[PDB]
A = this chain, B = another copy of it.
Amino acid sequence: MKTPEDCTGLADIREAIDRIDLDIVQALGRRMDYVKAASRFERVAAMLPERARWAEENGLDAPFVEGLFAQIIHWYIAEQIKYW
């Protein structure tokens, strides 16, 4: 995948973003496999600040990114409840 600097035009950039967004979706997909697998077995309060930290380390607005994981974490918690 051409690096941001090796992108000659908008075409290169958009295809890179599509690959990244798909990586994210596939990662979310894997995430759900792990969560459901955790069914047979403070956390949330520890997880969010941690993701906010990672966000800052990666040059992203921490609050926005933490808000995204707040949405993700609760969705997976709600999904897991039906797998009790």
Contact = CB atoms under 8 A, between A and B. Distances in A.
Interface of A: 4-5, 7, 9-10, 13-14, 16-18, 20-38, 41, 43, 47, 50-51, 54-55, 58-61, 64-65, 68-69, 71-72, 75, 79
Lowest 7 A-B CB distances belong to which pairs? A29-B58, A4-B37, A25-B54, A13-B38, A4-B33, A10-B41, A20-B31
A65 B43 CA distance: 23
A65 B60 CA distance: 20
A67 to B, nearest CB: 8
A50 B15 CA distance: 13
Contacts of A17: 31, 34-35
10 contacts: A4-B30, A10-B38, A13-B37, A13-B41, A16-B34, A20-B27, A24-B27, A26-B54, A28-B58, A29-B59
